[model samples]
Target: MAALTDEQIREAFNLFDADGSGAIDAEEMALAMKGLGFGDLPRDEVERTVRSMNTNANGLIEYGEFERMVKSRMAQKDSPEEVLKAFQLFDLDKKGKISFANLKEVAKLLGENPGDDVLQEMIAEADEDGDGEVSFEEFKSVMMQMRGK
Candidate 1:
């Protein structure tokens, strides 16, 4: 079980409220819930759960309901541990994979720059199955391959 502080609770919802709409819509909910470790729920089930959380009729999850839903989801699942949180760092969009685009985003956040080739090379090194992105297992290997002895 993941225990986030109340402040972390709000910031976590802030992560879900992508696009600054001030609420989490269905699409964002899918990404956000998965990002929050809701575990890739089927679209219909996600819709249903979000429906139950909306609490208002506008069909979007606002901050309050967001908290309620996250607390609700956590009962049935878990969130990032340290290494997983590192994966989350490169997976800002929370699509369950890290594309070079995500890599670039975090790099820029660090006030550093990555050449496009440098970015592509990273995915190539870690994306073992060659699906054009780094999955968690691939990322884990990359993170620990050199020093986990």
Candidate 2:
């Protein structure tokens, strides 16, 4: 995954903050997740995810914090170990498979706002067994395929 520019990070943060609240709340985060093709996640998981980015512990994520989080995440996309750790970031419920929503988030972080058609095509090509979700091995294969490009 490539690093995101400041402009792209700003765009992503704005997209997530749908209500123009200047900060993202749990409801907003849920809606954002859904919009990204992620179904309803557990409340605790949602809170946890938000809390991870809410540097102020104020239950909301401001643009500055969001920018920092995006930069930090983009930086972690470097090594294979870091990339694997990045994979676990989305397996929020400890599920072995990575959801399409998670992959979409990663794409955004990678500075690639892939369309649904492209996302689906990538998943279809990587999901060898036709499973809706991707296993670690499948994710690995997908990453390998990406490198070839």
Candidate 3:
């Protein structure tokens, strides 16, 4: 019914970037769950869910991984409105793809101060074939991964 506010998006990314390195590892995922108010979940459940979302297995859930989790979960017909709202929030430029700088700025706007490591990780996810930039297809992959429902 409503779009995700800038505040919500920024906060979510920042919380997962454990070590303040600007990226989130598995531990950061746990921290992210807790931050997002899912702390009581069973370890196995969390691990399974996290693994399902982490495409690169960097031991950390990059923005792409995080988006994947949301998209997959939203695949059910009973998708939550929040999923769509969040997805729209991510398509910052509305160009159908999100850039690394856009991601970093979003995090910064939220006061997360994402480091280069995290920005690079976000780029790695968007840039297929190591071209160092994200195209629309790559961007769609990121959006679809969020599973906004």
Candidate 4:
């Protein structure tokens, strides 16, 4: 992957600071990770990542540190394993499945509160086993299917 330009990195940082908090907490980092196609990374992992990059050790990612991290990651090709790691975050209770409510909450976080019909349609398309909830397998399948498109 090519490194992101300073402007692009700043934009990414702003996106992660969804709440305009000036710094990123674990929740914001997880959301940003998902947006970056890293999937639902666990908060613990997010914390560790932040700690490593947080030069000031303030337990948060300030803009400058965020920019450096983004540039570093963007320099490498995205990894499938990292994408799978995101599922753990979505699985919330580590239940290995993502419920409809989980999808809704995530949608809201993205500022996309879709109507029930739209939400159901997404589930219908991604829920491969008729289980209503999305297992990691189902989610991976959908992601793979969408990759070429």
Q: Which candidate leads in TM-score?
A: 2
TM-score-superior candidate, 2 or 4: 2
Estimate, for each residue in 3-93, the C-alpha lDDT of model 3 and write its tens digit.
3443444555656554578666666566657766743568876776666667566666667767645544433213345445666676555
Q: List model 2 lDDT by residue over 64-95, tens digit each.
A: 76566557655433545666776667565545
Clashes of 3: 10
Instruction: Enumerate clash totals for all models, in the order shown.
Output: 0, 0, 10, 3
Off by over 4 Å in 3: 1-11, 17-19, 32-39, 75-149
Per-residue error (Å), model 1, residue 62: 1.8
User: Regarding TM-score, does 1 or 3 come out ahead?
Assistant: 3
* Candidate 4 Cα lDDT to native: 0.60
Query: 9, model 4: CA deviation in Å?
Result: 5.1
**Model 3 TM-score, 2 decimals:** 0.37
Kindly list the per-residue Cα lDDT of model 4 for residues 18-125, writing each as its tens digit. Answer: 676766677666666776784455667566557656867766566776666656544432345675776556454545466778667765786543334445655786
Q: Which candidate would rank higher by lDDT, 1 or 2?
A: 2
In order, candidate lDDTs are 0.59, 0.62, 0.56, 0.60
- On lDDT, the candidate that comes out on top is 2
Candidate 2 global lDDT: 0.62
Q: After superposition, how far is residue 37 of candidate 2 from its true place, in Å?
A: 1.7
lDDT of 2 at 88: 69
Which clashing pairs does model 2 show? Answer: none
